Motif scaffolding. Sequence first.
Motif, PDB file in Angstrom:
ATOM      1  N   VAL A   2       1.121  -1.178   0.025  1.00  0.00           N
ATOM      2  CA  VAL A   2      -0.091  -0.076  -0.135  1.00  0.00           C
ATOM      3  C   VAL A   2       0.843   1.251  -0.089  1.00  0.00           C
ATOM      4  O   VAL A   2       1.771   1.558   0.836  1.00  0.00           O
ATOM      5  CB  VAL A   2      -0.949  -0.109   1.157  1.00  0.00           C
ATOM      6  N   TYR A  29      -3.506   3.598  -1.264  1.00  0.00           N
ATOM      7  CA  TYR A  29      -3.942   2.693  -2.471  1.00  0.00           C
ATOM      8  C   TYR A  29      -3.141   1.484  -2.945  1.00  0.00           C
ATOM      9  O   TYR A  29      -2.086   1.541  -2.592  1.00  0.00           O
ATOM     10  CB  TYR A  29      -4.325   3.285  -3.705  1.00  0.00           C
ATOM     11  N   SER A  30      -3.626   0.211  -3.282  1.00  0.00           N
ATOM     12  CA  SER A  30      -2.932  -0.806  -3.916  1.00  0.00           C
ATOM     13  C   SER A  30      -3.553  -1.310  -4.714  1.00  0.00           C
ATOM     14  O   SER A  30      -4.909  -1.775  -4.228  1.00  0.00           O
ATOM     15  CB  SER A  30      -2.268  -1.394  -2.602  1.00  0.00           C
ATOM     16  N   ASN A  33      -4.767  -5.216  -3.172  1.00  0.00           N
ATOM     17  CA  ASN A  33      -5.579  -5.072  -1.574  1.00  0.00           C
ATOM     18  C   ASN A  33      -7.058  -4.532  -1.820  1.00  0.00           C
ATOM     19  O   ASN A  33      -7.217  -3.726  -2.236  1.00  0.00           O
ATOM     20  CB  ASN A  33      -4.758  -3.986  -0.962  1.00  0.00           C
ATOM     21  N   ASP A  84      -5.327  -1.398   6.742  1.00  0.00           N
ATOM     22  CA  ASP A  84      -5.983  -2.303   6.001  1.00  0.00           C
ATOM     23  C   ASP A  84      -7.083  -3.514   6.832  1.00  0.00           C
ATOM     24  O   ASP A  84      -8.053  -4.184   6.262  1.00  0.00           O
ATOM     25  CB  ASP A  84      -5.305  -3.238   4.993  1.00  0.00           C
TER      26      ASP A  84
END
Length: 210
Positions: A2, A29-30, A33, A84
């Motif tokens: 991330v 963001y990723s 994920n 997360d």
Amino acid sequence: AVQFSNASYEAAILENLALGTEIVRVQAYSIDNLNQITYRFNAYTSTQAKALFKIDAITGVITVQGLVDREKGDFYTLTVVADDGGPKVDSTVKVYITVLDENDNSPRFDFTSDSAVSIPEDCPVGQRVATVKAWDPDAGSNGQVVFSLASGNIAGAFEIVTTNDSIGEVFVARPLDREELDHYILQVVASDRGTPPRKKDHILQVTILD
Ligand SMILES: [Ca+2]
Ligand SMILES: [Ca+2]
Ligand SMILES: [Ca+2]
Ligand SMILES: [Ca+2]
Ligand SMILES: [Cl-]
Ligand SMILES: [K+]
């Protein structure tokens, strides 16, 4: 892994901004994920910083939630976690907040400032006759004090010298004459050097003795 939209975030904000004013938005963001990110301050963020600023869990928007006063603190560091909510290690980012000065204080006279003095008529030109003191906690020009004798200084009898942006020294500027004039009501003005200047008055009465 991330990532954030920026390596670090910074903002310069005016003191006294309304509760709920947005400062910055953090975004992470990723691709690999699919959990919704929860943004939060970690324990490296000071209690003082947490009291003034909050971060929305979902949006990452940082808003003002306390009274931001440059006179109490001009710099804060927040550490935001892109959490997360799962076992992967979560990334963090720094947010650096600088608080800029407003001219939100007028000069205030110290209570030791002279209000009433008596001097004889032969008080020589150049003699220090009274002292006033004022304080202005703002930064730079906003907190620099200059003194003036705005009214009641009949015939330029007195002058006031400013030292250290705080002390006003009243001297005899011209020879005095009790029969000519035996009493002065000097309006001492302390002004800051803001644009526009903020000002405060102090009355200094001078009796001329026989
Ligand atoms: Ca302030
Ligand atoms: Ca995690
Ligand atoms: Ca000021
Ligand atoms: Ca200020
Ligand atoms: Cl932003
Ligand atoms: K926004």
